[PDB]
């Protein structure tokens, strides 16, 4: 079980760690988060009390380094940093744990929610979507635009998600225009899976990361990417059966975790109605269709 210590908490802030959140008071003697489960990526995220503008956070994997948070009063944010002195880090963490100045990652034993939301998400792939090679962790915020959004403005601060565009030469074989537009199987299976992602695990990893950025930061371009990756599968008549079954589980847990009050902004009516009721896969997503009909019947 790993730890992310905080040097201090000089500004009042709501801190998220994965799907959990807690409030810390200005100058509260709070020194970090312990008992973080090993084996998953994690996200630690922030919303300041004085300016709910800009949710921001850091994706990390404690197996890749010893990471801590320190507030920067010049840039006005909580920053993640790596401590290279392992002995200093262990000594700092031990003292803070002894003084009981840490929140404990509050995972219920029964609960597989975080695994189910991050099953295919790998830190190495996150670092190719979010490019800042000098750090082992990745910063994301509410305002960051995607490469696709930028084509339609600072490239170093962009989310480099795989570009998906249904009316593009990449998506449409010359001479197969109607076929490829109405059945996207060649774009899914040949261009994206075989060509770009290499396998369905990487595709699902990017889909799951896009959802989590949409949910935790309200990142609009990430929401667009998540829906595009769903629609591309649903609009393909030929999809490996194991992929459809896994997609149903993926979306079920995403829909289950979404805050009830954010559905209006985080769920695209057209995509979901099309995927669940008109698409080739309208009968292949039983678990997702059932939770959507019981939790968000208005959208449909």
């Amino acid at each position: 079980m790993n730890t992310v210590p905080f040097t201090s908490a000089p500004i009042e802030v709501t801190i998220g760690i994965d799907q959990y959140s807690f409030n810390v008071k200005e100058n509260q003697p709070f020194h970090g988060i312990k008992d973080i489960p090993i084996g998953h990526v994690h996200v630690i995220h922030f919303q300041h009390a004085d300016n709910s503008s800009m949710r921001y956070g850091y994706w990390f994997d404690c197996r890749m380094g010893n990471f801590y948070i320190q507030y920067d009063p010049k840039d006005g944010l909580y920053k993640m940093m790596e401590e290279r002195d392992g002995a200093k880090f262990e000594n700092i963490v031990h003292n803070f744990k002894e003084r009981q100045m840490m929140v404990s990652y509050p995972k219920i034993d029964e609960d597989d929610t975080w695994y189910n939301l991050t099953e295919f998400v790998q830190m190495d792939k996150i670092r190719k979507i979010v490019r800042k090679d000098e750090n082992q962790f990745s910063y994301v915020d509410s305002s960051m635009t995607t490469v696709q959004e930028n084509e339609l403005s600072d490239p170093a601060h962009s989310l480099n998600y795989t570009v998906i565009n249904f009316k593009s030469r990449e998506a449409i074989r010359p001479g197969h225009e109607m076929e490829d537009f109405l059945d996207k199987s060649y774009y899914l299976n040949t261009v994206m899976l075989q060509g770009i992602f290499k396998n369905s695990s990487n595709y699902f990893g990017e889909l799951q990361f896009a959802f989590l950025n949409a949910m935790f930061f309200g990142n609009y371009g990430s929401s667009l990417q998540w829906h595009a990756m769903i629609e591309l599968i649903c609009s393909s008549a030929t999809v490996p059966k194991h992929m459809l079954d896994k997609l149903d589980e993926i979306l079920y847990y995403q829909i289950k975790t979404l805050p009830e009050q954010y559905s209006d902004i985080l769920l695209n009516e057209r995509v979901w109605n099309i995927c669940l009721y008109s698409s080739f896969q309208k009968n292949s997503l039983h678990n997702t269709e059932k939770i959507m009909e019981n939790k968000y019947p208005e959208l449909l």
Partner: protein, 237 residues
Amino acid sequence: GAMNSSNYAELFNNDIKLFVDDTNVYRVTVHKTFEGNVATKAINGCIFTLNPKTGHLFLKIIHTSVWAGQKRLSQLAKWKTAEEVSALVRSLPKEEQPKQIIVTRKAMLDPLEVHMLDFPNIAIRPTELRLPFSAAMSIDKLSDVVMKATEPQMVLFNIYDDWLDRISSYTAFSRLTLLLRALKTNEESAKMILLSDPTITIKSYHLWPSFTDEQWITIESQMRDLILTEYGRKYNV
């Protein structure tokens, strides 16, 4: 974006452009079968691809063999329309390629956009105008070439005849749309008007009669009456 009453004069500027109407591409007669069920029989159709500035109607005749063994023909017809328009933009030399293609029905947008991906600089636009181009098959010489075709064929008609020698494109298009709206609202009356007087003939190389300027004003007035008439006969006014 969309073409409407506000930007109507753009049709007659010096960008080359084409109205594409797909309403006569897929044509059927509906009939009873021996068992008392209903079936359709396709008949030849056409794509109506018109040039606003000269009156040239570039008619691609859609022969019924293109539907043989195909499913979902109303959907296919839109894609076939887009395939044939794309093939026309490609046949063309570059300076002659239109700059914009305006589709008369919004369901043509995605098919045409997808078929024209190689031409990112050609704008594909809808319109809010209710244009009467479906009535093109009420022009006898156009209907005749379509019904007689035994194979796919592209046959042209300057749809303005020689009018542009005497009137502007704006006025020519307004006359064409009036004639076609008339034919669409009451084809029998409209055609009676056009042929009532045996001394005004249609030249072999033309589609409409050789009316004088004064006779066109009389004709045009009669068509407005017919349209207003039918609008009363219809709504009881």
